[PDB]
Every structure is written in C-alpha cells, then in structure tokens.
C-alpha cells in the first residue's frame, strides 16, 4: 500500500489516475515528477490560486466533472509545462481574469460543458500557444470571434458544436481576416443554424469545416450554404446525426451552393433521407479530389457511372440497391467498405486506380481477378476481405503490380483449379485466411516470388497433409498455417524458407512435436504450436530447431506427464527460456497430474 493510493499508478512517477475518489482537494500524496494527472469526478468545487503548486512537471491535467464552480487568478500559475487542460462538465459560475495565467505551454484546452455563454469574456487571449480549443456543449449564441483570437496564432482546432448559434454574420469573422498561420479546423455541428450571411466566409481559408445537423429544413440548409460562398476549405463535412432532428427532404438543389466554395475533400456523413438516386445531387463536387459518403442510402446507383474527377472516393456503411457502376478516369483510391444491400460486384473502369479496398460488404464476385474487372493495370493494393463467395477465374492478368492482397474471411472458390496467383510476381502480402480453401494443387502459390507474408489460417489440405507448396516463396518472413486441420508435414515443406521469422502452426492436429521440418529455418524467431494435441515427442525428433528460435508457444496441448515421456518433459525444462506462458502448459494425462503445470511437474524418473 503506497503513498499515492487510493490513486492508481498508471505509469510509475509519470501518470496517476485519481478519478472518483471523493477528493475534496488537489491531492498532496503524488510524486513531484507527475506529468499526467487524472482528477476527474472529484468534488473539488473551487480552485484557488496555485492549486497545482505540487505538480510543476504537469503536462496533462484532467478535471472533468469535478463540480468546479469558481477558478481564481493563478489557480494554475505554477504549471508552465501544461499542454493539455481538461475542464469538461464543470458548472463554472466564476472564472477569474487570470484563471489561466502561467499556462505558458497550453496547447489543448477542453472546456466542453462548462457553462460558457460567450467567448468575449473567456479569459484565454494570452495563450498564444493554444492549438486546440474545445468549447462544445455550451451556451454560446454568437460566432463573433473576439479580438484576442488575433493572438491565438497557433490555433488549429476550434470546436463550437452543440452551442446556441443561430446566425453568422460577415462582421462576426472580422478577426480572422487579420490572421496569419491558418491550419484551422472548425466544428459547428449541432448549432440551431437558421442563417449564414452571404459574404461571411469570403476569402476565409479553413482546413476543415464540419457542419452536421445544423439545419431545421432543406431551405434553411440551402440558405446557410449560400452564406459559405467563397469559402476555401480543404475538408468539408456535411450531414446529420441518426439520434438527432433530421432534414425531411433532400433533392438536387440541396448542395447547389457548393459550386461557390473551393473544396478539396468532401464528406457527407449520415443522411436520414433515402435518396432515390444521385442525378445532379453532387454536381458541384465533380472535381473535388476526395469524395466520401458515409451511412447514406441510395437505391439507384446507376448514376455513379458519371465521370466525376475524384481522385479518392469513399463509400462506407451505405446501403445501395446495387453495386455502383464506376467509371472514373482519375480515381486513384477507392474505399467501398461496410456497405449493405445490392452486393454482387460488377466490373468498374478505373484506369488510375492504385488502391482498392472492397472489404466488409458481403460482396459476391463472380469472376476474379484481372485488369478487366477494375479497368486498371496500376493496382498496388487490393482488399477483398469479409465478403461473400469470390470465384477465381483469372490469375491477376494486368494486375502484375499488386503488392498487397487480402481475401480474409471471404469464401474463395476454385483456388486449386489453377495457379490463381501466377501473375503476382510483386505481391508482398497475401491473406487467404478463413477462405475455405481446400488446398489440392501444389502450384497454388506459383508466381509469388516476392511474397513476404502469407496468412492462410483456417483452411485445409488434401489428406490433412502439408505438401511442398512453398519452395518458390524464398522471401517469406511470416507464415500462418493455424487452424488448418494439419496432421502431417512434408519434411521438405519449409526447406527454402530461410527468411521465415514467424511460423504459426497453432490449432492444428499434431500429437507430437517433430522439429526436423524446421531445421532449415535459419531466421525462425517465433513458432506457435499452441492448441494442438501434442502429448509426447521422441528425444531425436526434438533436436533440429534453429537456435534463432526465441518464442515457442506450446501452451494448451495434451501433455502426458508420465516417466515414459521424461525426455520430452526434460526437454521442455531445458527450453524454458524459449517457452511462452508456461503457466498455460498443463498435463492432460494421467488424471494424477491433470491440470498440473508441466514445468513445475513432480515426477521421479
């Protein structure tokens, strides 16, 4: 029981959590070297001068939900190293002018739900180091940025979401026009926004504007978007919240005002309204370099065949009637993930495409894969995991540049009917784990000479036997054969794999541990043999492990702990320094010893 208790020591000398411990005062029982202090949920109520004198080293200070009602001049005066101060959910009634003097290093100030009514009198003007101000969930009615904002030269994030702003006027942003270093992100979500004045954002430059769930109606939305005219935004995020008041209609005119801003990246994040189709909807965003829809519903996806100039398209957690037909000349990166509905993949035409993420859609793929499915010869990265049945009919013709291929948990078919990976001379990473591949062809991995990582857990092999299907895979460093119902190894399966570092043989059906097949694995560091049925091993077969082996996992096997197997049990003691979680290595038999840790075994042999 230590001097810092009841607080929890997260990182000795450094980080202490004194959350919810009925502390009525800043504790005095902590190291002077403490950098991170969590004092959230304590009835501190009041913060007088030099309240944190005991913590000259503090960098992160959390005072969330501490019932703090008044903070006096100099309260933090000694904390010239503090970068993060968190004040969330304190009903602040009185906040002295010098409340935050001494905070010479403050980068992040979280004042969420601290009863803030106005930024004008909010005593932070002197914190020139401030990178982020979060004042969400307060009572601010005015987007008039006070003049001291001219001082906040490093401000990169300002969060004003969940306040009471109804209107934004041109003269509200007077201060911003004077201002140099602009990497400014602004969240204005969940303000009951009824009007933004045309001109208000003329010649304003923002990194990011988030405006979700601001608008009572479509017309109010249209009105307010017009007031953004001339805004220059790297990233614009529109949309609304599912658990929140939502727009009742949403037609082609809804985003017509976007034609008057300069937007590099666009996201629409959640829309309640079911879109019949997108004809004309996104006309102002045809040349945005990044276009993203999340959680929107679109019945007719026929209209995605339009040649937008997007370089990055992201469609996530959407519901589409059909798989979109995509013909995008400039698209480099496609993320189409976690979508529902129509879900048979159909050919896309994407000549610039290098990055393809098609995962987690439950997609069917009638005949995979080649340039003609995608329209590109430049693909480096293909993620087709967590989908439906993918029938292999082409061995990646035209996709010779692929470096990363993931089919994980997709039901692959026809995997043994030809060398389905033959074209892939540059593939570095392949995951065909849990694809229900039943290996019945020794040429299954022909072509994969650059392969470094091969995950194929949870498949199976003809005769539960591992044949020599790897001899061409010289550059392999990671191989996962766990859950493959393996019973026998070809003594030669692994001979060429002299770069292999991690071999996973977990959860297969081995009854003994034969080290011979592993003798040529000069780089082998990690060998996982857990969750097999290993009961014994002959002395001779235990001797061939490369000495590079650092982690052997033999946990959860069926060790027989009689004198008949003394050599194996002895060998296990001898290799203790290689063995992982020896606690979890238990005698399965005899019943005398069942449950007894193999290393602490009491036997006389």
């Amino acid at each position: 029981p230590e001097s810092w208790e009841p607080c929890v020591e997260v990182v000795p000398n450094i980080t202490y959590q004194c959350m919810e411990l009925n502390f009525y005062k800043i504790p005095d029982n902590l190291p002077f070297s403490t950098k991170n202090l969590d004092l959230s949920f304590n009835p501190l109520r009041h913060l007088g001068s030099y309240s944190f004198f005991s913590f000259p080293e503090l960098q992160v200070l959390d005072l969330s939900r501490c019932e703090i009602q008044t903070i006096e001049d100099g309260a933090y005066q000694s904390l010239s190293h503090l970068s993060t101060l968190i004040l969330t959910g304190n009903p602040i009634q009185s906040l002295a002018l010098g409340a935050f003097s001494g905070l010479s290093s403050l980068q992040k100030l979280v004042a969420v739900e601290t009863n803030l009514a106005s930024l004008e009198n909010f005593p932070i003007g002197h914190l020139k180091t401030l990178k982020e101000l979060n004042v969400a969930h307060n009572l601010i009615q005015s987007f008039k940025l006070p003049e001291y904002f001219s001082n906040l030269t490093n401000l990169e994030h300002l969060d004003l979401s969940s306040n009471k702003i109804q209107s934004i006027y041109c003269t509200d942003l007077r201060v911003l026009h004077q201002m140099p270093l602009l990497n400014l992100s602004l969240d204005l979500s969940l303000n009951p926004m009824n009007f933004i004045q045309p001109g208000a954002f003329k010649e304003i430059r923002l990194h990011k504007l988030t405006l979700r769930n601001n608008f009572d109606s479509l017309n109010v939305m249209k009105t307010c978007i017009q007031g953004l005219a001339g805004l220059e935004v790297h990233r614009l995020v529109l949309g609304e919240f599912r658990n929140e008041g939502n727009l009742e209609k949403f037609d082609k005119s809804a985003l017509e005002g976007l034609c008057n801003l300069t937007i590099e990246e666009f996201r629409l994040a959640y829309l309640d309204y079911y879109l019949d189709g997108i004809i004309d909807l996104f006309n102002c965003l045809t040349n945005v370099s990044s276009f993203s829809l999340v959680s929107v519903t679109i019945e007719r996806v026929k209209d995605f065949s339009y040649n937008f100039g997007w370089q990055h398209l992201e469609l996530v957690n959407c519901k589409f009637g059909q798989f979109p037909t995509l013909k995008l000349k400039s698209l480099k990166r496609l993320t189409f993930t976690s979508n529902k509905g129509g879900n048979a993949f159909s050919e896309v035409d994407l000549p610039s495409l290098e990055f393809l993420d098609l995962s987690r859609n439950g997609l069917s793929f009638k005949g995979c894969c080649s340039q003609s499915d995608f329209g590109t010869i430049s693909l480096k990265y293909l993620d087709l995991s967590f989908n439906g049945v993918i029938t292999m009919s082409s061995n990646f013709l035209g996709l010779e540049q692929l470096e990363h291929l993931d089919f994980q948990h997709s039901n692959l078919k026809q995997m043994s009917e030809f060398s389905v990976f033959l074209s892939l001379r540059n593939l570095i990473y392949l995951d065909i784990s849990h694809t229900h591949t039943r290996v019945a062809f020794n040429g299954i991995f022909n072509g994969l000479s650059s392969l470094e990582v091969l995950k194929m857990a949870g498949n199976s092999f003809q005769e539960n036997f591992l044949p020599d299907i790897f001899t061409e895979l010289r550059n392999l460093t990671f191989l996962d054969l766990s859950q493959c119902q393996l019973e026998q190894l070809s003594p030669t399966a692994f001979n060429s794999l002299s770069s292999l570092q991690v071999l996973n043989m977990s959860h297969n059906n081995f009854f003994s541990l034969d080290t011979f097949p592993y003798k040529c694995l000069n780089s082998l560091q990690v060998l996982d043999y857990s969750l097999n049925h290993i009961m014994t091993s002959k002395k001779q077969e235990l001797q061939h492990f490369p000495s590079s082996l650092a982690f052997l996992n033999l946990t959860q096997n069926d060790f027989a702990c009689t004198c008949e197997h003394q050599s194996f049990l002895q060998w296990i003691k001898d290799q203790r320094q290689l063995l992982v979680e020896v606690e979890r290595m238990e005698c399965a038999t005899p019943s005398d010893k069942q449950g007894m840790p193999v290393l602490s075994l009491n036997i006389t042999c």
Partner: protein, 140 residues
C-alpha cells in the same frame, strides 16, 4: 446489487442489473416497450460516462433458457464522423439523448433471456459499464 425494472410490453418483461464493480448511475427509458415480435420506439439515455464515447462498442453475451449464444460484438461508434452524436461525448460530459430503433423478423422461444452488455470505449479501449439485462418472453 439492485434490480432495475425497465418496462413491460405485450411480449416482454425487461429489467437489468450491473455486472461491473463501479456501478455508474445510468438512466434508460424505452418508449414504447420492446415487443420481441417486432416494434419501434425511442431509447432514452441519460449518462455521465467516465470515458470518452469515441469508438463505443458492445460485447453482448446472450442466453436463452440457459443456452449460451456466441459473443456478438456490436460497434456503435466507428471513430470518425459517426452516425450518433453521443459518439463525440467526452469523459464527464452529459449524455442526454434519444435513439430510435426498429426491428422485426425473428421468432423467439418462450422463456428467459439474459443479455450481458459490456460497453467498451476510449483510446486504450476499456470497459465503460457492464449491464445484465433479463428479458422474460411470453409470446403472442
């Protein structure tokens, strides 16, 4: 250790307890009460979370008349521009929110269902709460 009666419906009798040590007060109203035959309504929640709701998910351990179901993992907040506004909530922030729900389409055996709902959120993602729902199902 107390039982918290949520509501009765034409189908269902719903209560919960805590399955964690630090039993943070939560307020859960359902209007109208869940009918297992299929229903729609509003889930009202009032909560002051002791972690950020960022990346909230539920592990659900369900039991039907003694028979365990495989764990389900239900992701609520994916991390970035989330559907639900409460995903943005911070440690110590008031969550006073109304979430709509809807379902149909599954016949349920008569009897006793338990649902251990293990909420998880934050950055070094830790447990927010654990509630154990008991739902008595009397079909028709």
């Amino acid at each position: 250790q107390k039982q918290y009666w949520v509501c009765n419906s034409s189908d269902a009798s719903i209560s919960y307890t805590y399955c964690d040590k630090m039993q943070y007060p939560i307020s859960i109203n359902v209007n109208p009460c869940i009918e297992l035959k299929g229903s729609k309504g509003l889930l009202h929640i009032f909560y002051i979370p002791r972690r950020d709701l960022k990346q909230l998910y539920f592990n659900l351990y369900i039991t039907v008349n003694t028979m365990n179901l495989p764990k389900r993992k239900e992701v609520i907040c994916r991390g970035s521009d989330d559907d639900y506004s409460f995903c943005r909530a911070l440690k110590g922030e008031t969550v006073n929110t109304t979430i709509s729900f809807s379902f149909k389409g599954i016949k349920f055996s008569k009897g006793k269902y338990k649902c251990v709902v293990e909420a998880i959120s934050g950055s070094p993602e830790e447990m927010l709460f654990c509630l154990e729902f008991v739902i008595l199902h009397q079909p028709n």
